[PDB]
Structure 1
Amino acid sequence: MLMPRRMKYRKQQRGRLKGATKGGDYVAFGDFGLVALEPAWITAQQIEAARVAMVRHFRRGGKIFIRIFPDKPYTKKPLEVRMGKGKGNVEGYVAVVKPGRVMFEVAGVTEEQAMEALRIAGHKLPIKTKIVRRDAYDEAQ
C-alpha cells in the first residue's frame, strides 16, 4: 500500500494535532470530495480500505483521487516490555488529517454512484466525514 520509498529519518516525534487544515481544503480534481470533520492519524490500511471500497462499488469506471499520503511513521514497542531502553519499532505509517481536508475526490461517475461510494469509503475511516461537491468557491481557489 502507501508508504514513502525513502526517508531522511526513520522515526519521528508525535507532534500535535491542533487547528484546521493547512491546505487541500477545496476540491481541485474530481466532481465530489470526502472532507474530514475531526483530526486524527489516518493509517495507510484505512486509506487502502477506503480506496478499495470505492473502486469495488464503481466495479468499473470513474476516477479516484487520494489527496493525503501517509508519511508519518508510526512506532510501537514490543508487547509486554517495560518502559525505557530506546524508542519503539516502526509498525506502520499514518497520514496527519486535520478538520477540513478533502481526503478523496471522485470524478467521472453518476451523482448517486459518487455519493454512495463516498459513504462506504467514509465508513472505513476513524473520523466523521462530510460529502461535498465542487462549488464555484472551489473553482475560485
Structure 2
Amino acid sequence: MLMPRRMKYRKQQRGRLKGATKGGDYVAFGDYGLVALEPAWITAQQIEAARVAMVRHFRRGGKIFIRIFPDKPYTKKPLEVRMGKGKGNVEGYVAVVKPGRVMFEVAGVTEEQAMEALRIAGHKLPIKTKIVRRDAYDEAQ
C-alpha cells in the first residue's frame, strides 16, 4: 500500500488536528465524493481497505480517485519497553485529515453505484463520513 518513496526525515513530531481542512474541500475530479466529517490520522491500511472496497463493488468499470496521501510516518516503541531510550520505530504511514476534506472521488459510474461504493468505503474508515455530489459551488472553486 501507499507510502512515500523517499523523504528528507524518517520521523515527525505528532502535531495537532485543530481546524477545518486547509484545502482539498471541493470535488475536483469525479462526480461523487466521500468527505471527512471528523479529524484523524488515516492509516495507509485504511486507505487501501477503502480503495479495495470500491473496486470490489464496481467489479469492473468506473474510476476511483484518492485525494489523501499517507506521508506522515507513525512511531511505536517495541512492546513492553520502558519510557526513554529515544523515539520509537516507524511502524507505518498515516494521512492527516480534518473536517471537510474530500478523501475519495468516483466517476464513470451510476449514481446508485457511487452512493453504494462510497458508503462501504466509509465503513472502512475510523471517522464519520459524508457522500457528496459535484456542484456548481465546486466547479466555481
Query: Do they fold alike, i.e. is TM over 0.5?
Result: yes
Q: Runs of at least 4 residues of structure 1 off by over 3 A?
A: none
Determine helix, strand or coil for the equivalent of 1:69.
coil
Q: C-alpha displacement at 1:3, in angstroms?
A: 0.2
Root-mean-square deviation over aligned CA pairs: 0.3
* Identity rate, percent: 99
Distance in 1, Cα, partners of 2:129 & 2:92: 23
Distance in 2, Cα, partners of 1:114 & 1:4: 29
1:3-54 CA distance string (max 9 Å, x none): 0000000000000000000000000000000000000000000000000000
Segments of structure 2 that go 5 or more residues without pairing to the other structure are none
Distance in 2, Cα, partners of 1:97 & 1:128: 12
Q: Which residue of 2 aligns with 1:68?
A: 68
Segments of structure 1 that go 5 or more residues without pairing to the other structure are none
Q: C-alpha displacement at 1:134, in angstroms?
A: 0.2
Distance in 2, Cα, partners of 1:43 & 1:88: 17
The two structures have a TM-score, normalised by structure 1, of 1.00
Distance in 2, Cα, partners of 1:116 & 1:2: 24
1:48-68 CA distance string (max 9 Å, x none): 000000000000000000000
1:52-131 pair list within 5 angstroms: 52-131=52-131
Distance in 2, Cα, partners of 1:16 & 1:36: 17
Q: C-alpha displacement at 1:75, in angstroms?
A: 0.4
